[model samples]
Target: TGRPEWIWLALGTALMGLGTLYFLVKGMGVSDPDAKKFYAITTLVPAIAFTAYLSMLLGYGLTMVPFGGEQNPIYWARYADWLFTTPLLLLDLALLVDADQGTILALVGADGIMIGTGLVGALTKVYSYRFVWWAISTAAMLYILYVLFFGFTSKAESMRPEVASTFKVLRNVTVVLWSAYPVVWLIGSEGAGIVPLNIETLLFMVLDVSAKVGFGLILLRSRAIFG
Candidate 1:
């Protein structure tokens, strides 16, 4: 019955809910609306994750796909959540650098394509097409990485020294956590089936918590935002 996966998903739901609550409470009464803006945007990452995990817990977020003579449940809700949240995460990074609007828009546009391609790759019935979509998604991810490490990093350095240091910490945390996702996709049910569904569920939950909730704490708690 994959009940263990259910437990992990439920735990993810609770953690995201707690994350949202923490943001809501700590976000209150900031005298500077500018600082409050960071809180507001960061809060949505975990709030949306909570909904996705809740839907998954209730059995409404996933769909079945046939692979290797077995039917596997693909949690489309997570991708749907990613479509919104990933862009927001990028925005948080871009905002830290005070990146220009064009760069932000391009980064977000590429982020959307990356998630969309990965989702299609997972849902596609044809094995070859799955890898094709994965390749395209990886290409888009490369663009995001370039912008993050190159364009954004340079901008951060030109700003206050504190901003540069904080940006490096947050960006590195995001990069390390986000990079594991594709490996999970390759080994998990969607790809080679090297990883079982239960373990895949646990792995993704851990990554999502660290990327969203964990990232939010580091960003919001940093002096760059409040000071």
Candidate 2:
């Protein structure tokens, strides 16, 4: 038989799903246009920051190893790994600073603003389904914060300097995975002009939104959901 832990995980996920549906419905019913706009803007700032971070990281990697040099599979693979894992290093640094408490509180505050805006935006249908995607992205950011603070801090503190450095590298890899947003528009649209939706684009859009927007909202409202 499969592990009992799997069963517990399944049950927990199911409960979370139910709670999310309830909050979404409740949020939809509350009317406050100005409040929603404020939240939306708050959410957008993070979105932009994350987007820029990814873009810059990618650009840096590309500059170091151009596509022409990526003729070898190993080159491509290494580049891909670097592209995905670098941001996580930044995230770990962000959470491990001496003033990490203040940083985390600020991040949470910004996250709250995003969730408030996302709730309103989702209910109103303002920015296509992109609003949903953005919310999920926000959630992933919050989850990473939670893990860094609550789950990883003790381990981080207990480890030797050498061990801690290794963990910091690994943790950053995990963070990059958590933070990735497929960025369908950039991938699909070449330079300018309108991008028509295709299956690939649609699929990435769905994945990005769910990971960023949906997850972000859930993390933000977890206390309300469970406690």
Candidate 3:
């Protein structure tokens, strides 16, 4: 577990963890409800999930699982942590959309299920039917995509111009990066051997930075643009 890969992975998770604290603390004085919403979304959820997954890695070298006598790494803990955090990312989107309370809550709940299915998929190992779990997760992911892009956008269109405009930009960012997870999941862990573990780690690192930190910065600093 003291290997270079392990250490670097630890650092990767640590980086995300510390950045979460920074963003959360940075929001302490911001009175702009929208900007504050950005920090609100970014702070604890991403921070805790990152830290929790990292702790698992440092404590147990489960970063990579050797399946079927094959030396491949599967990040089940990463998926578990996503179950904790991914929906909050969606919630930030929901808030920006200024969506209906009940519908938004339902979407977030579905997001949790989406990630939960993913965690389950990641753990159902060495079996031919493992893809079934991944399939279910992907189905949930597609529904999330539908809700965010279609249903949510329908609502945003009728919102005030500024709010609608904000939704447009933030929505695109979320849709683009957030949509990529399943693709990556397939190639990396669920695909089982298509993408290398090291590459998966690096790719996920990039996504987390962009999705959590970069997205946070944009939302925190942004002002009303359209309606």
Off by over 4 Å in 1: none
lDDT of 2: 0.38
Candidate 2 lDDT tens digits, 150-184: 65655566645644564455455445544443243
lDDT of 1 by residue, 1-227 (tens): 45668989989999999999999888885767767989999999999999999988988878888766778778888898899999999999988899999999999999999999999999988777888998899889888988899999999988898889989999899889888898899888888888988999999999999999999999888778854
- CA RMSD per model (angstroms): 1.3, 17.5, 3.0
The lDDT values for all models are 0.89, 0.38, 0.70
The weakest ten consecutive residues by lDDT in model 1 span 65-74
Pairs that collide in candidate 3 are 64-73, 161-226, 161-227, 162-226, 162-227
- Report model 3's TM-score to 2 decimal places: 0.84
Worst 10 residues of 3 by lDDT: 218-227
Encode model 3's per-residue lDDT on 117-222: one tens digit a residue. 7666666656555577778877877888888888888888777777777777777887788778888887775575678666777777777767777677666656
Strongest candidate by TM-score: 1
1 or 3, which is superior by TM-score? 1
